[PDB]
A paper describes a structure:
Crystals of ctPrp43ΔN•ADP•[name]- in the presence of the U16-RNA were obtained in the space group P6122 and diffracted up to 2.62 Å. In addition to the ADP•[name]- and a central magnesium ion at the active site, seven out of the 16 nucleotides of the RNA as well as one additional phosphate group were traceable in the electron density (for an omit map of the RNA see Figure 1—figure supplement 1a). Hence, this complex is referred to here as ctPrp43ΔN•U7•ADP•[name]-. By this ctPrp43ΔN•U7•ADP•[name]- complex structure, insights into the sequence-unspecific RNA-binding mechanism of a genuine [name]-box helicase were obtained. ctPrp43 consists of six different domains: an N-terminal extension (residues 1–96), the RecA1 (97–273) and RecA2 (274–458) domains, and the C-terminal domains which were assigned as degenerate winged helix domain (459–526), ratchet-like domain (527–640) and oligosaccharide binding-fold domain (641–764). The RecA-like domains and the C-terminal domains appear to be stably associated by multiple interactions and form a tunnel inside the [name] molecule which is the binding site of the U7-RNA. The 5’ end of the RNA is located at the RecA2 domain and the 3’ RNA end is situated at the RecA1 domain. For the first three nucleotides at the 5’ end (U1–U3) two alternative conformations are observed. Most of these interactions are formed between the sugar-phosphate backbone of the RNA and the RecA1, RecA2 or the ratchet-like domain. On the contrary, the uracil moieties do not interact with the helicase with the exception of a hydrogen bond of U3 with the Ser 555 main-chain carboxyl group from the ratchet-like domain and a base stack between the U1 and Arg 562 which only occurs in one of the two alternative conformations. [name] was known to bind RNA in a sequence-independent manner which is explained by the ctPrp43ΔN•U7•ADP•[name]- complex structure revealing the almost entire absence of interactions between the bases of the RNA and [name].
Author numbering: 61 to 758
Write the structure that this text describes.
Amino acid sequence: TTAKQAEAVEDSDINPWTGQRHSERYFKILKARRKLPVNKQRQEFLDLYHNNQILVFVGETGSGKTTQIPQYVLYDELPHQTGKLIACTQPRRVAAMSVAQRVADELDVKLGEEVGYSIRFENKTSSKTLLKYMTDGQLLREAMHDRDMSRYSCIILDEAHERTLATDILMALLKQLSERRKDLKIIVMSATLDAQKFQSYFFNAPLLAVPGRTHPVEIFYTPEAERDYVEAAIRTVLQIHACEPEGDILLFLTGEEEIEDACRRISLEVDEMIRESDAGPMSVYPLYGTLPPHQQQRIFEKAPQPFRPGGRPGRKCIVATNIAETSLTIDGIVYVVDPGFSKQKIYNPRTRVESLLVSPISKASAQQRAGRAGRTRPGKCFRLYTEEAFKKELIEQTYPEILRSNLSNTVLELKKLGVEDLVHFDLMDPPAPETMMRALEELNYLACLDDDGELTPLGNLASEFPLDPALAVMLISSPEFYCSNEILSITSLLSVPQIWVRPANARKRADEMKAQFAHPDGDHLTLLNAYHAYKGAEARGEDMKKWCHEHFLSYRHLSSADNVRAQLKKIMETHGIELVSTPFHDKNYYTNIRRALLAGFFMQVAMRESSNSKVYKTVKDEQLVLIHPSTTVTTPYEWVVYNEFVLTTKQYVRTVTNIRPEWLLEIAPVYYDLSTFQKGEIKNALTRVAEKIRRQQA
RNA sequence: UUUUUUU
Ligand SMILES: Nc1ncnc2c1ncn2[C@@H]1O[C@H](COP(=O)(O)OP(=O)(O)O)[C@@H](O)[C@H]1O
Ligand SMILES: C[As](C)(=O)[O-]
Ligand code: BEF
Ligand SMILES: [Mg+2]
């Protein structure tokens, strides 16, 4: 129960957790572990952990927080052996997997037994699991079926500074839960926190600060600002490989296509360096969220050897988003290149629209990016901006996601978690009252909430799916339209990135191949055609990787959609949601699917402004939009339903489907009662249709 | 005319 007693157990020739002998690797790792900064203050942690329920833990990047603290807790529970687990949340999936593997080696156990991890589509845990690393979202999902979270004796919220939606909800639940359960220890960790703020939020909780740093990270700034950060990044990477001593490179960029372009350009230049300038080999790895876990994990591959002894060193270059910004320890990395940008989510309360925008990062993020080096060996960080641009122009801390998001989903889960009063629900940063009210009214229109704001059985059922309420309600109500199987597939396809591939090289052949899946009356149906063909060739036994290539479809996203569909189907079967289909050659086969979409998306409908106008007008809001250029429908109806809203240098609605206005009055009579509609051509048009429908009464 | 993340 004290530090020196626990250390004696760690030195034992036999492993307490397996009943088998400790390997020789274990003892060398253990020797290196005890040189970490957090190890110096282990006792100071222990007596604070004992005397307090909630604790804030701060230490530099490299300190030992994520890997050592849960082990400290585990060894503290050692003398009496509980069934309850120790939880450690990570904001990223790659983080949860990588750290769990590391700790598994540190405890000399195999991954998935004593030390495991849990993320979406992968629950690598067992009945022997004592320590579980997971994503904050995964834990939040677990809490929606276990409010008290009885499975856990200790929950460690890591990298809390990121302030994701899950993190904020979790902090609020855990704070209120800590009054209910005194047998629940809670620890909040980060290298870049606002300590006093977090302390004050958790009932003036104690703070433990570890001062030390394992290895130094030298930080360099540009003398003047550069306008093309992608060009400056590529230039920096190539300069390092050409002149600097050995050491792998971590480069941060903003998005997938930017990264894929960068990797191509880096590889091209390196290849010419290698052939004509005696440069060493360089492997380039892309890293972003939509990559499968197997390809993400390839960043831990060893850098290539030099071509010849005494030759220029071979090295590795990881080109990543900010999923590699925190938590990860990539051994071999010496150089970090920080252009200072990330794609961030912004929200407009007025226009109901959320969008992505490439923006400057915060000082905390910048510090974190640099912290990916200086972990195993001294590091260098090349910040592609000015030192005074760092101190004056960069925000101290990125704004919380809950202040930058649509809260329709967030609110629905809060009700499911059993939050009695939304107004007095103590969130660390409370969102704007209008954002909150508008979420309540959307959930009200979807019949997920009462008029008094209490959960509907429908709403309770909607919170079971990894989907936004509108998408969930569409899926749940689909059997009423006799096409639940098809909506299930469409729902899955809407939950993944665009399956369509259109390289600059052959855009016109890509559109040629897309044209054979094209359905005149909507993009949703076009997706369904592409999916059926995909599954058709799959069952036929053809290899899909090539099949997707000749058809210009993303095998990556199509495969990802199948994972979603399998998960969603299992949920539907669990809660007795009927799975049915209409025979393909039936006349109403397509119309049923189109009408089914409206069951959840009746609030995302736009009318054509005039006779020969390409401008559409959203209902109620009356926003002026254009149909996204990547649309299948050649000649669109005066009434369409759209799935998403996008903002390029023009305002677009995306993935639209031609509908008939009489469907709107049929499926959503409350939202489309015309007393609510006010002084509009949309109300005029809708009024005429209602009268026509009444006439058809005869 | 790309999905930054996460369920
Ligand atoms: N996968 C790994 N390979 C080699 N060393 C590692 C690995 N993970 C962690 N370490 C060592 O343990 C230290 C602590 O890592 P970690 O607990 O993740 O730090 P923190 O959570 O404070 O950032 C690292 O700085 C590094 O020295
Ligand atoms: C806008 As900047 C990250 O170059 O200071
Ligand atoms: F602060 Be550690 F790098 F997660
Ligand atoms: Mg960490």
